[PDB]
Amino acid sequence: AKCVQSGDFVYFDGRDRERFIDKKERLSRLKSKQEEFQKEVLKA
Amino acid sequence: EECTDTLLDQLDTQLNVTENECQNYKRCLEILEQMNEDDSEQLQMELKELALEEERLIQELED
Amino acid sequence: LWIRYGAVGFITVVARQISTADVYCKLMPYLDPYITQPIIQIERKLVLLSVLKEPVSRSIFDYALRSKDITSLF
Incomplete structure (x- = not known):
């Protein structure tokens, strides 16, 4: 439960070594880039 | 074990969805940038001509 | 015509629901x-x-x- 609260866990099958917290940060970063493109598209 | 794998699977799907939307915006921006700038002035001149034709047709229809 | 205008109804409602950016980047390609x-x-x-x-x-x-062999026809 301690690993789940801090998000310091990874898939048990080893398919991906990126932690849940790391994936969450990447998802937020990608969402930010998407909005930046969307804004430039809106301006254009 | 199952709950942790299910949580990572859901987060992995969200990441892909964000990447696809980012790719689409990158493509759409490139498409709008590559589409030659349609002459706003040329369309405005054409519109003024069509309005005159309509006004002519309105008078002709009245007649 | 009922279906035809019904489709217009769906596409027009969808077009009003999404952002103008998404309309040109996502809605337009489907239409x-x-x-x-x-x-x-x-x-x-x-x-x-x-x-x-x-x-x-x-x-x-x-x-x-009405064709029975719609699979072969398509």
Whole structure:
């Protein structure tokens, strides 16, 4: 439960070594880039 | 074990969805940038001509 | 015509629900095969109804849907 609260866990099958917290940060970063493109598209 | 794998699977799907939307915006921006700038002035001149034709047709229809 | 205008109803409601950026980047690509001209003002029911391509002929559409070998036909 301690690993789940801090998000310091990874898939048990080893398919991906990126932690849940790391994936969450990447998802937020990608969402930010998407909005930046969307804004430039809106301006254009 | 199952709950942790299910949580990572859901987060992995969200990441892909964000990447696809980012790719689409990158493509759409490139498409709008590559589409030659349609002459706003040329369309405005054409519109003024069509309005005159309509006004002519309105008078002709009245007649 | 009921289905045809029904589709206009769906596309017009969808076009009003999404952002203008998404309309051009995502909504337009789904509609492009059925529209005669690329108009950005898809949000106006009158505009979309005016830009629709002519529907399939009832004789053609009915004859295809009535075909027993629709898999082979398609």
